[PDB]
């Protein structure tokens, strides 16, 4: 008997897809996200925003996925982009993502 209960055992975890912009809009509860090779665009709130609300700006690359929203599409969990030209350093291993 081979088939049954088996497992225990390498398991990759490639990445799909995500969706991402820049905040050109600037407000106190809601805002708007740009895009660059594409011209769509879509409404987050601040709610739901995870990141620095306290410093956030002109408009820090931000990401976001876009679901099946009945209505209008909007961007779900949104989460800050990291610096633009990364800087060598002192750290290698897996590292995050």
């Not at 925003?49 to 599409?73: A, C, M, S, W, Y």
Request: hydrophobic letters at 35%; proline letters at 3%; one cysteine or more.
């Amino acid at each position: 008997g081979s088939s049954g209960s088996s497992g225990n055992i390498m398991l990759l975890k490639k990445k799909q897809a995500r969706c991402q912009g820049v905040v050109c809009a600037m407000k106190e509860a809601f805002g708007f996200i740009e895009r660059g090779d594409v011209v769509k665009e879509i409404f987050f709130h601040y709610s739901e925003f995870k990141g620095d609300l306290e410093t956030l700006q002109p408009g820090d690359d931000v990401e976001f996925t876009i679901k099946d929203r009945n209505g209008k599409e909007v961007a779900t969990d949104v989460r800050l982009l990291p610096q633009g030209t990364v800087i060598f350093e002192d750290i290698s291993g897996p590292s995050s993502g």
